[PDB]
Amino acid sequence: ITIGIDDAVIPEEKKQYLEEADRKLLQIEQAYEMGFLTDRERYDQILQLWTETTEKVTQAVFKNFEENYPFNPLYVMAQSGARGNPQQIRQLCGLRGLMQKPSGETFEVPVRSSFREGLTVLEYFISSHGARKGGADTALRTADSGYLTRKLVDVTHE
Amino acid sequence: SMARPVSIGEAVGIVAAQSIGEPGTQLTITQGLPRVIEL
Amino acid sequence: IEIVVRQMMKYVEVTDPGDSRLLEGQVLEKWDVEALNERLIAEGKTPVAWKPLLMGVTKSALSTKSWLSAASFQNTTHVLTEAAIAGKKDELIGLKENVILGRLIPAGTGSDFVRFTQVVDQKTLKAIEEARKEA
Amino acid sequence: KEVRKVRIALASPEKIRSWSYGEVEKPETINYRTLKPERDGLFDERIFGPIKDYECACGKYKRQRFEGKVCERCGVEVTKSIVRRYRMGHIELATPAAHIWFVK
Amino acid sequence: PVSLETGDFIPDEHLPSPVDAATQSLLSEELEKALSKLSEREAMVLKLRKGLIDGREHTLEEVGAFFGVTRERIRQIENKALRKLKYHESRTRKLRDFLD
Amino acid sequence: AEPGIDKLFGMVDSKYRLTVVVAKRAQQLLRHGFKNTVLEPEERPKMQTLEGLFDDPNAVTWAMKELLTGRLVFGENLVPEDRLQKEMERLYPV
Amino acid sequence: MEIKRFGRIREVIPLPPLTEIQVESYRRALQADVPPEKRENVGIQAAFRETFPIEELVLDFLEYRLGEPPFPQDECREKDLTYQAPLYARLQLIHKDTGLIKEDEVFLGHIPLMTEDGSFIINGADRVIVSQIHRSPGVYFTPDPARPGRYIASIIPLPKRGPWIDLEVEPNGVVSMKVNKRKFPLVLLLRVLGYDQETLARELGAYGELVQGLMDESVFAMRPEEALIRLFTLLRPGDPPKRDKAVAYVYGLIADPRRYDLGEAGRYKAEEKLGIRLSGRTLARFEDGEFKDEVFLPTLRYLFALTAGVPGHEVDDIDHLGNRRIRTVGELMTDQFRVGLARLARGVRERMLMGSEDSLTPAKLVNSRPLEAAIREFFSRSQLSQFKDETNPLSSLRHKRRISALGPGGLTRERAGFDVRDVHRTHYGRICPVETPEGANIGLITSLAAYARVDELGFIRTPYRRVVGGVVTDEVVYMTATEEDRYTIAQANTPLEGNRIAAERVVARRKGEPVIVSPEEVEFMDVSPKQVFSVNTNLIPFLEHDDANRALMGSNMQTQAVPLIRAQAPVVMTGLEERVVRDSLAALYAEEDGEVAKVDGNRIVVRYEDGRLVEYPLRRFYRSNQGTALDQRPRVVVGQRVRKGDLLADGPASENGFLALGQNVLVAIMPFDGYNFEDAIVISEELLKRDFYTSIHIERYEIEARDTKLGPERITRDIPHLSEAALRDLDEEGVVRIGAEVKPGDILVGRTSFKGESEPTPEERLLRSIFGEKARDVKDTSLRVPPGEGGIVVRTVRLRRGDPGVELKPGVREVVRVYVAQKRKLQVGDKLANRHGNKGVVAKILPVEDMPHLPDGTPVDVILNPLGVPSRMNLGQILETHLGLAGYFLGQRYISPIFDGAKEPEIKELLAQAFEVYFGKRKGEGFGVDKREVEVLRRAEKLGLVTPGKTPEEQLKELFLQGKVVLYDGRTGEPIEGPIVVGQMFIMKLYHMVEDKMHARSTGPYSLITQQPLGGKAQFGGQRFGEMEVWALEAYGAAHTLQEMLTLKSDDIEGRNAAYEAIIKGEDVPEPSVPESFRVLVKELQALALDVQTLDEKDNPVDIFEGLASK
Amino acid sequence: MVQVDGGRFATSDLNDLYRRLINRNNRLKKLLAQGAPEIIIRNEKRMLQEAVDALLDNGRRGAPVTNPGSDRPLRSLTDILSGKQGRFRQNLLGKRVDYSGRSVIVVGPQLKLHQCGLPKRMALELFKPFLLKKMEEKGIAPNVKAARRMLERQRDIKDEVWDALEEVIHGKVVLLNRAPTLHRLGIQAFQPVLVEGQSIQLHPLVCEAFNADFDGDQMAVHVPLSSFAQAEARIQMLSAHNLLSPASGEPLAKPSRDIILGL
DNA sequence: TATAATGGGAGCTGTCACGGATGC
DNA sequence: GCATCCGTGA
Ligand SMILES: [Mg+2]
Ligand SMILES: [Zn+2]
């Protein structure tokens, strides 16, 4: 058991799903420019589209792994429960996915790159917001967890 | 922990408090830890 | 969670005093008002009419009978003043009290249930038996 | 006897004086030269007990053959110095002052 | 002076450590063990003279008047007691380690 | 895990009672210098030194094994404390 | 060796000087090189100009000057002094009545000088002033959280420069102003400014319903005088409304430049936002006897305009980097200097009253003490003044580029939520999104970007290349975020033929938002990806292949790298590892062209073109703040011709001018016997054999002999009751000899201190009588080696009293320092990490024969577990390993820039070229494929790694291109059942080491009051058993263990003594007693006049003090 | 009021508070004895109340009294009793304890579930009194004092004392703890196995309970003294004796990572 | 020990929640 | 009956 850069296997289905999502995106933009749907509905439709796309490429990764390379290290570690989960593997092989603004709002454009392909400085910068927000969330969470724990201990101790 | 009837003298309250508390740092479409404290 | 919630429901509020010395709106433990009510109802006196009262863990922990636990939790000044005024006695029921005092906690090997257990070998047991049989 | 209950209650001025081994009349702590405690001060040995075990200030009675004996010279009882963690002093106020705990 | 709260890093030099107290206890016990190798009289002379009893060191006239002998006699038996102590010490080498 | 810990947990109505029993027995063995033991010379717990096998200095192991044998009687109010102490001191001087 | 660099991106500009944020700031603050008459009004000059003239006799300021440092930096470090320069001020005391003028230059004390590298030396210790990010002064408009359709206007000046005025529109309709928690109608203040209903009506009348809310008849009825008195009555209740007092207070609160200062940046921001011009930094003026408005009316107008919905008026983003600025060293120091100067001014004004009103000189009138006290306070006890991190040059370099939101006049950690911690869209090119601490400080402590630089106003700017038409110029423009939002900025990787954009569609940014744009729409373009990330972050190769959370740890841990004796630059670099060694001044270079005259270990002598002979001393084995040895070694030889900027000596943690934070090792990624389980690491003993990861560490010990009332402390070789074996390595003076090996318990410095007077116990009387030996007058206080420490003594420094050039603190006769060094080999428990955030402690060291090895017989070095890779999502280490294998067999290193890298195909190429050398050698040597290689190939083609039917060599090459090789288990000899990734990885030994962290205690020192054990390793303290540990023992139900923790093991005196005695006697431990800290609790409750009684079952009092506290 | 290492003096804030109180009190008594006007007496009494307040609880009412040249509020009795650093939480509900140690954890695969790798020196210091007793039993030292003075210097330590140490710790267990302790399994009992090196070796299966990994985490060792404490640890607190979560009832120590992967 | 002199100066600001008492 | 400040806690 080892890990090479090729052990993260980009499915052939990826490009297909991406192109489909692209033409769908174009259709939505066209539907917007003709004044059929508002900015809100357009944004929501784009987000939903990219979410479903993400699910599709994930399933593509795991199906390709199951059928073609059943002993693939990432696949084995994920399946056995030794390490990793479908989403992280998806980030390694399929797309990184949608990222959110500091305001919680999600960017219309997703990160099409994987960690095996490597990201672009703009994509990396976009992801950094989420990462930072996560770290801050954790740090701020531990304290409240401890305080609550102590409250419970004090009320239940006798 | 022993999968058998609890021994008399076991401190229940502390085990309860700890059992609820320990996963707390893991709590994250979800209300989460603030909801827990709210309750 | 049922344990904690159980500690949350611990208190009740008096709707009517009945024949007791309690006051309307006064808050006290359910156990105490039930003992009081069974003492009054066996005395042939009008029992206390009360109401279930739910308070959060912090208030419930600060409302405990032990003033050592309450003082070691939070609001030390408030707790200690009310306790000193009341001339409260801490019966050392809980764990925190005995921890502060540095005694043996009333749990595990410190539980009165398992604490007084004795151990003896059959030889000594029989010798003592014969000793007590000759008296 | 074994400890069972622990009681807390308000302390009367008479009780506070009953605890006290003497009144501290001076803000002084220790002497700026000898480093020994000042008399009627916060660190005074006449009030709170001896600095050294079974030995008075001036050193007239230096051993345990005298215990409970208060020296006539320095006025320091000869006992275990551990009592300096125990014995209370007091300060008599010219005017009554409210305990802030029962006010604020 | 400077404020202590600026105190948790400051050791207590006054109270004896467990090691020191244990050493003093073993010292007293070993001393009694060595004094048991004398007669009760010549041991009592040393105990009275060095202040192990009553805390005060008694003069030769006081120990002599207590036992009912001459001060020369009490000084002499004190000397022979100390001598037997020195011999027993040279032999067993027990009390050397307490000399620091 | 401690050898035969499950049977030991089976002996008592509460695990803490087991703990109390083992501890008290171990204190008995320590105070009386193991010569009050219910174990036969071949049942004695052994320890490997550079010299060879010696008696296990650990009184708790001894107490647990003794407990496993069934030659120990435990419970509450078996005998007044002073009487037990003095009788044990009579049978096994210190 | 050969260095092959990749990437197509050509940066038009080099990285700016990295320490400039410190150096240029302080330089601008002091103006020491500027002739006094030519000094601009800033910094120290601004402080003097702001404080003076002191009006009351009139004392005025002329000019100041800074002399030369009394001592060099090294000597300051040696003698525990401060590197500083004397500050003199020429003052002329003028009597306006007489006309009398007495002029003199007064000495105001010293000011700390900054070293070349941007740090300070305070009391012998190297320190760094961290820049502080805060909200920029100005006028902001933020949405009122309560009333949605309403807004809050906030006027913010500099910290401690005066109050925050809040303009708000109340529900009743009247406009309210808030100062010092007090709220009053703004109309009154407007009347004080001299405004009339006519002027307000015509000015603000455009916005319909608000002006009527501004209208109050009673206010306009009274003149500005009565309105002023009224306002003073509103602000200052109980204070008699004397007119002069009202004028003084109101002027002092608003118009006073002395008491009230908006930033120069605040001034600019106000002028820009409101669209006005300020005559000064104050909200108003006192002119011709009355008050004249500056700020308030434009802000009120803007507020009403924003509320009305008038186009062109926006709410402000306070997290925007246009609204947030940076206070550098110069500004903080200038602030504290201004405070001290103000206090000195108070002293002066007080001195102008007492004494003789006739004869006075500037010297008599000025007490410098408050100023000295202020500056010293700042450089010593401030939060922004931090102990310098010297661990490696990059440590300090990063430390100087730190940006903190904490400190005086800044956020509390608990005051900081998500918003402050977040990465703003304006952080691009300015504040690194990657490198921030992992913990509570996350987002509060940050790092300056590589190309980022702070302007004169305090805002961070980032460079952008101008694009005119479709052509990209070479001119760069540094922009503030506010200015950045104005244009459309293309990415740095956008395709280029010559200076023209080669793409039909480019990726750009508009207000931070990503957008696809045509080349005609491209106004500017990024300079380089490097500008997005900090220095440490830019040192991580294949950064685009690493998850941000792990890259954070990579950055952070690069700072923790220990300098190694054999330290070498990484085989895969980012190209920044040279410049970093340049800007951090550890490494030595040649000033001009010339020939090296002399080469020694101690020094290097160079003869330049000028003919002048310059001698450079080398720092050898100098102890840094963290104990890591800072030492320079010569990289040149006698007679070698060198140019300008050529390397002379290599600094600590640098190899031939390149940054070396660790070593390149041969790593195999594979699980090994659970020894690498959970991030643990297995290493080869070969590493210890060839001294890889071996580092020198120096510790400094210190002792003082002082004067006592019981007699002097003496440092001597005569120590009571000690043998010669103990005194062996001590010289005649009592100091340990240089070169001796000291272990725990050994004596570094002999010392004797007169015993405290005590009566010997009867036991001691009898003992003394028995052995016939008098008790010595002195006791052994000698400084000894602490447990777990030791080494070879490399230095001794002795400073006595009466000897020339030295004066100690009062009472101290002498001081002795002993410097002890040790050579630390890598060992189990030491922490290793790579640049990608993979960190682990070494859990096993195997012999060479147990190590997995290549078929040619070459064993690996480090064995990493692959389980660390997928969850952590850092793939950069993998690629680094592959290219490291290629570089291993090709005998070469590489430069892969950030985000413009070496990509997969090129690495495949290099790997092929490597395989030719790895295999073709074997085939030429007369060896065919191994049987085990055949089996491994069978399983590999079962895995789908190699195409079936090809020759063994073709399949082995197919594996090699995947970076995988055949590996034989050293124990069995049998191969691993599959091909394993093996290659060269750059791994560092982190500052966290077991030798430092291992601690154990039986019994030891106890605290004074609580009588509980002390804490920390240095004090030989015990481990803290807290509330949570008590909860653990309780939940377990172990009563006696817990009681042992609460009593016998801590704070129970009788209990612990009896326990130790029982254990050493072989007895079982005795029943515990009352904890002393409970007694302390009781007595502390008694001092609060609360009686605490311990009672029995009979409710009868129980005395735990045992009659000692009762009369 | 105590003299520190450097001959300098350090003192508690309670002293300065008491001095304030006494000075204002005495000045009050003198002002009364001299028959001062009602204004002065009023002011003095008010200052006396302010003083008593400052003594008992500082900052409670009005501006907190600070030492000259400092913004740091003095520490009153209330500030000593309450708070996270207060007497109760800091010194009562928890304490720093003797017979304890700390070090960096490393994974022993070879350990049985009930075992932990314990560095020689650590155990030598932790079990030190027992070691003194054993050394006095055997011929290593004349007595306890000699043995301790022998162990004081590291170069005076021979090879027999290690064997004696092995005799000492046999059958006994130690408690390993990792912060934060989030449940009762944050502390567990293990049979110590003396190992060369400065690192504590921890069994893999318990890593999930402590939430411990090998990236540089550290643990603390505690040595239960009495036969009672030792019985508690060996029975109730032993690692092999708790295999299931007290929370969910599910298995706590179970195959993970490498183990699962291999199987 | 004797000209006469007669109300003080810093605050300092991006936390969250419920328990009071006020008191709008 | 409901808005208005303050006090204590990590
Ligand atoms: Mg960890
Ligand atoms: Zn006396």
Side-chain angles (χ1 to χ4, degrees), chain G residues 1 7 15 95 111 242 247 255 393 437 491 503 604 610 642 681 728 746 790 902 1010:
Chain G
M1 73 211 71
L15 257 48
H95 204 296
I111 282 182
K242 199 174 184 61
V247 174
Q491 287 294 331
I604 299 182
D610 326 330
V642 296
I681 301 182
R728 180 203 306 170
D746 284 20
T1010 60

PDB file of all heavy atoms in Angstrom, chain G residues 1 7 15 95 111 242 247 255 393 437 491 503 604 610 642 681 728 746 790 902 1010:
ATOM      1  N   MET G   1      26.188  21.038  -8.610  1.00  0.00           N
ATOM      2  CA  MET G   1      25.211  20.257  -9.360  1.00  0.00           C
ATOM      3  C   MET G   1      24.389  21.160 -10.274  1.00  0.00           C
ATOM      4  O   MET G   1      24.499  22.386 -10.214  1.00  0.00           O
ATOM      5  CB  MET G   1      24.290  19.500  -8.405  1.00  0.00           C
ATOM      6  CG  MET G   1      23.278  20.386  -7.699  1.00  0.00           C
ATOM      7  SD  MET G   1      22.846  19.777  -6.060  1.00  0.00           S
ATOM      8  CE  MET G   1      24.362  20.107  -5.163  1.00  0.00           C
ATOM      9  N   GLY G   7       8.725  26.921 -15.380  1.00  0.00           N
ATOM     10  CA  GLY G   7       7.767  28.014 -15.398  1.00  0.00           C
ATOM     11  C   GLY G   7       7.995  29.058 -16.476  1.00  0.00           C
ATOM     12  O   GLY G   7       9.132  29.400 -16.803  1.00  0.00           O
ATOM     13  N   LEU G  15      11.310  40.913  -5.463  1.00  0.00           N
ATOM     14  CA  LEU G  15      10.713  41.118  -4.150  1.00  0.00           C
ATOM     15  C   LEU G  15      11.333  42.340  -3.478  1.00  0.00           C
ATOM     16  O   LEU G  15      12.550  42.517  -3.508  1.00  0.00           O
ATOM     17  CB  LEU G  15      10.927  39.883  -3.274  1.00  0.00           C
ATOM     18  CG  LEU G  15       9.753  38.928  -3.056  1.00  0.00           C
ATOM     19  CD1 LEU G  15       9.084  38.586  -4.367  1.00  0.00           C
ATOM     20  CD2 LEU G  15      10.234  37.665  -2.360  1.00  0.00           C
ATOM     21  N   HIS G  95      11.130  84.591  28.521  1.00  0.00           N
ATOM     22  CA  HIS G  95      10.232  85.332  29.390  1.00  0.00           C
ATOM     23  C   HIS G  95       9.581  86.403  28.528  1.00  0.00           C
ATOM     24  O   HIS G  95      10.231  87.368  28.130  1.00  0.00           O
ATOM     25  CB  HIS G  95      11.015  85.972  30.538  1.00  0.00           C
ATOM     26  CG  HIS G  95      10.190  86.250  31.757  1.00  0.00           C
ATOM     27  ND1 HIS G  95       9.142  87.148  31.759  1.00  0.00           N
ATOM     28  CD2 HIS G  95      10.264  85.757  33.015  1.00  0.00           C
ATOM     29  CE1 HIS G  95       8.604  87.190  32.965  1.00  0.00           C
ATOM     30  NE2 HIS G  95       9.267  86.356  33.746  1.00  0.00           N
ATOM     31  N   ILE G 111      17.191  56.640  23.479  1.00  0.00           N
ATOM     32  CA  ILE G 111      16.160  55.964  22.703  1.00  0.00           C
ATOM     33  C   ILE G 111      16.767  54.728  22.045  1.00  0.00           C
ATOM     34  O   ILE G 111      17.870  54.792  21.507  1.00  0.00           O
ATOM     35  CB  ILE G 111      15.589  56.902  21.617  1.00  0.00           C
ATOM     36  CG1 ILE G 111      14.610  57.897  22.233  1.00  0.00           C
ATOM     37  CG2 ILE G 111      14.895  56.121  20.515  1.00  0.00           C
ATOM     38  CD1 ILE G 111      13.968  58.811  21.219  1.00  0.00           C
ATOM     39  N   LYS G 242     -18.826  78.092  34.110  1.00  0.00           N
ATOM     40  CA  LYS G 242     -18.037  79.282  33.829  1.00  0.00           C
ATOM     41  C   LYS G 242     -17.679  79.278  32.349  1.00  0.00           C
ATOM     42  O   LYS G 242     -17.278  78.249  31.805  1.00  0.00           O
ATOM     43  CB  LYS G 242     -16.778  79.318  34.697  1.00  0.00           C
ATOM     44  CG  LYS G 242     -16.136  80.694  34.814  1.00  0.00           C
ATOM     45  CD  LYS G 242     -14.978  80.679  35.801  1.00  0.00           C
ATOM     46  CE  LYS G 242     -14.398  82.071  35.996  1.00  0.00           C
ATOM     47  NZ  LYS G 242     -15.403  83.021  36.548  1.00  0.00           N
ATOM     48  N   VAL G 247     -15.441  77.002  27.212  1.00  0.00           N
ATOM     49  CA  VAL G 247     -14.593  77.181  26.038  1.00  0.00           C
ATOM     50  C   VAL G 247     -13.414  76.216  26.072  1.00  0.00           C
ATOM     51  O   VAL G 247     -13.136  75.530  25.089  1.00  0.00           O
ATOM     52  CB  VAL G 247     -14.057  78.624  25.935  1.00  0.00           C
ATOM     53  CG1 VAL G 247     -13.058  78.740  24.794  1.00  0.00           C
ATOM     54  CG2 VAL G 247     -15.201  79.607  25.749  1.00  0.00           C
ATOM     55  N   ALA G 255     -11.730  70.827  19.018  1.00  0.00           N
ATOM     56  CA  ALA G 255     -10.853  71.618  18.156  1.00  0.00           C
ATOM     57  C   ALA G 255      -9.369  71.568  18.522  1.00  0.00           C
ATOM     58  O   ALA G 255      -8.524  72.013  17.745  1.00  0.00           O
ATOM     59  CB  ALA G 255     -11.335  73.062  18.103  1.00  0.00           C
ATOM     60  N   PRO G 393      16.971  31.954  10.522  1.00  0.00           N
ATOM     61  CA  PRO G 393      16.811  33.284   9.918  1.00  0.00           C
ATOM     62  C   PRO G 393      15.385  33.582   9.432  1.00  0.00           C
ATOM     63  O   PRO G 393      14.894  34.708   9.594  1.00  0.00           O
ATOM     64  CB  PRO G 393      17.778  33.234   8.738  1.00  0.00           C
ATOM     65  CG  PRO G 393      18.881  32.356   9.227  1.00  0.00           C
ATOM     66  CD  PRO G 393      18.229  31.312  10.098  1.00  0.00           C
ATOM     67  N   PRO G 437      -1.638  31.697  12.757  1.00  0.00           N
ATOM     68  CA  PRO G 437      -1.561  30.676  13.808  1.00  0.00           C
ATOM     69  C   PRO G 437      -2.757  29.727  13.821  1.00  0.00           C
ATOM     70  O   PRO G 437      -3.859  30.091  13.410  1.00  0.00           O
ATOM     71  CB  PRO G 437      -1.543  31.507  15.090  1.00  0.00           C
ATOM     72  CG  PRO G 437      -0.899  32.776  14.688  1.00  0.00           C
ATOM     73  CD  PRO G 437      -1.361  33.044  13.282  1.00  0.00           C
ATOM     74  N   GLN G 491      -5.228  37.902 -14.374  1.00  0.00           N
ATOM     75  CA  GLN G 491      -4.344  36.989 -13.651  1.00  0.00           C
ATOM     76  C   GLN G 491      -2.927  36.975 -14.219  1.00  0.00           C
ATOM     77  O   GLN G 491      -2.700  37.377 -15.358  1.00  0.00           O
ATOM     78  CB  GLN G 491      -4.921  35.572 -13.644  1.00  0.00           C
ATOM     79  CG  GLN G 491      -6.126  35.400 -12.734  1.00  0.00           C
ATOM     80  CD  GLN G 491      -5.777  35.565 -11.269  1.00  0.00           C
ATOM     81  OE1 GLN G 491      -4.655  35.279 -10.849  1.00  0.00           O
ATOM     82  NE2 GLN G 491      -6.739  36.030 -10.482  1.00  0.00           N
ATOM     83  N   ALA G 503      -4.578  35.464 -25.212  1.00  0.00           N
ATOM     84  CA  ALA G 503      -5.841  34.763 -24.993  1.00  0.00           C
ATOM     85  C   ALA G 503      -7.035  35.580 -25.477  1.00  0.00           C
ATOM     86  O   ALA G 503      -7.047  36.803 -25.360  1.00  0.00           O
ATOM     87  CB  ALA G 503      -6.001  34.405 -23.521  1.00  0.00           C
ATOM     88  N   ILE G 604      37.305  36.455   7.764  1.00  0.00           N
ATOM     89  CA  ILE G 604      37.618  36.469   6.339  1.00  0.00           C
ATOM     90  C   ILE G 604      38.073  37.864   5.925  1.00  0.00           C
ATOM     91  O   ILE G 604      37.339  38.836   6.099  1.00  0.00           O
ATOM     92  CB  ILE G 604      36.395  36.088   5.479  1.00  0.00           C
ATOM     93  CG1 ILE G 604      35.915  34.675   5.806  1.00  0.00           C
ATOM     94  CG2 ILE G 604      36.726  36.205   3.997  1.00  0.00           C
ATOM     95  CD1 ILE G 604      34.743  34.225   4.956  1.00  0.00           C
ATOM     96  N   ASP G 610      39.062  48.886  -4.610  1.00  0.00           N
ATOM     97  CA  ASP G 610      39.502  50.153  -4.041  1.00  0.00           C
ATOM     98  C   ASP G 610      40.905  50.032  -3.457  1.00  0.00           C
ATOM     99  O   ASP G 610      41.594  51.033  -3.257  1.00  0.00           O
ATOM    100  CB  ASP G 610      38.525  50.602  -2.952  1.00  0.00           C
ATOM    101  CG  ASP G 610      37.092  50.207  -3.259  1.00  0.00           C
ATOM    102  OD1 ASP G 610      36.738  50.117  -4.454  1.00  0.00           O
ATOM    103  OD2 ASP G 610      36.319  49.980  -2.303  1.00  0.00           O
ATOM    104  N   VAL G 642      36.224  37.322  -6.267  1.00  0.00           N
ATOM    105  CA  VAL G 642      34.796  37.461  -6.013  1.00  0.00           C
ATOM    106  C   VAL G 642      34.252  38.768  -6.579  1.00  0.00           C
ATOM    107  O   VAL G 642      34.991  39.737  -6.753  1.00  0.00           O
ATOM    108  CB  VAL G 642      34.484  37.392  -4.503  1.00  0.00           C
ATOM    109  CG1 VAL G 642      34.846  36.022  -3.947  1.00  0.00           C
ATOM    110  CG2 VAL G 642      35.223  38.492  -3.755  1.00  0.00           C
ATOM    111  N   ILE G 681       6.671   8.430  12.794  1.00  0.00           N
ATOM    112  CA  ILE G 681       7.668   8.301  11.736  1.00  0.00           C
ATOM    113  C   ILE G 681       8.763   7.290  12.086  1.00  0.00           C
ATOM    114  O   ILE G 681       9.222   7.229  13.226  1.00  0.00           O
ATOM    115  CB  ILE G 681       8.306   9.671  11.409  1.00  0.00           C
ATOM    116  CG1 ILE G 681       7.231  10.669  10.974  1.00  0.00           C
ATOM    117  CG2 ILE G 681       9.360   9.541  10.325  1.00  0.00           C
ATOM    118  CD1 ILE G 681       7.780  12.023  10.584  1.00  0.00           C
ATOM    119  N   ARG G 728      36.485  18.441  41.106  1.00  0.00           N
ATOM    120  CA  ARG G 728      37.481  18.126  40.080  1.00  0.00           C
ATOM    121  C   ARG G 728      37.571  19.151  38.947  1.00  0.00           C
ATOM    122  O   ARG G 728      38.659  19.620  38.612  1.00  0.00           O
ATOM    123  CB  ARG G 728      37.202  16.743  39.488  1.00  0.00           C
ATOM    124  CG  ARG G 728      38.187  16.315  38.415  1.00  0.00           C
ATOM    125  CD  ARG G 728      37.578  15.259  37.510  1.00  0.00           C
ATOM    126  NE  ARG G 728      37.058  14.124  38.265  1.00  0.00           N
ATOM    127  CZ  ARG G 728      36.317  13.155  37.738  1.00  0.00           C
ATOM    128  NH1 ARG G 728      36.003  13.185  36.449  1.00  0.00           N
ATOM    129  NH2 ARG G 728      35.885  12.158  38.499  1.00  0.00           N
ATOM    130  N   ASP G 746      26.100  18.017  38.674  1.00  0.00           N
ATOM    131  CA  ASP G 746      27.431  18.617  38.664  1.00  0.00           C
ATOM    132  C   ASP G 746      27.392  20.094  39.038  1.00  0.00           C
ATOM    133  O   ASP G 746      26.360  20.747  38.911  1.00  0.00           O
ATOM    134  CB  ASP G 746      28.088  18.444  37.293  1.00  0.00           C
ATOM    135  CG  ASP G 746      28.599  17.038  37.065  1.00  0.00           C
ATOM    136  OD1 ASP G 746      28.131  16.114  37.764  1.00  0.00           O
ATOM    137  OD2 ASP G 746      29.470  16.859  36.188  1.00  0.00           O
ATOM    138  N   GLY G 790      22.721  19.321  30.540  1.00  0.00           N
ATOM    139  CA  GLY G 790      24.151  19.080  30.601  1.00  0.00           C
ATOM    140  C   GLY G 790      24.837  19.350  29.275  1.00  0.00           C
ATOM    141  O   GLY G 790      24.205  19.797  28.318  1.00  0.00           O
ATOM    142  N   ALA G 902       6.595  22.908 -12.275  1.00  0.00           N
ATOM    143  CA  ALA G 902       6.863  21.796 -13.164  1.00  0.00           C
ATOM    144  C   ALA G 902       5.620  20.932 -13.081  1.00  0.00           C
ATOM    145  O   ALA G 902       5.213  20.532 -11.991  1.00  0.00           O
ATOM    146  CB  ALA G 902       8.070  21.021 -12.692  1.00  0.00           C
ATOM    147  N   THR G1010      -0.529  28.259  49.163  1.00  0.00           N
ATOM    148  CA  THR G1010      -1.339  27.056  48.984  1.00  0.00           C
ATOM    149  C   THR G1010      -0.655  25.775  49.456  1.00  0.00           C
ATOM    150  O   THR G1010      -1.320  24.773  49.722  1.00  0.00           O
ATOM    151  CB  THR G1010      -1.743  26.884  47.513  1.00  0.00           C
ATOM    152  OG1 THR G1010      -0.564  26.773  46.704  1.00  0.00           O
ATOM    153  CG2 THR G1010      -2.554  28.080  47.050  1.00  0.00           C
TER     154      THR G1010
END
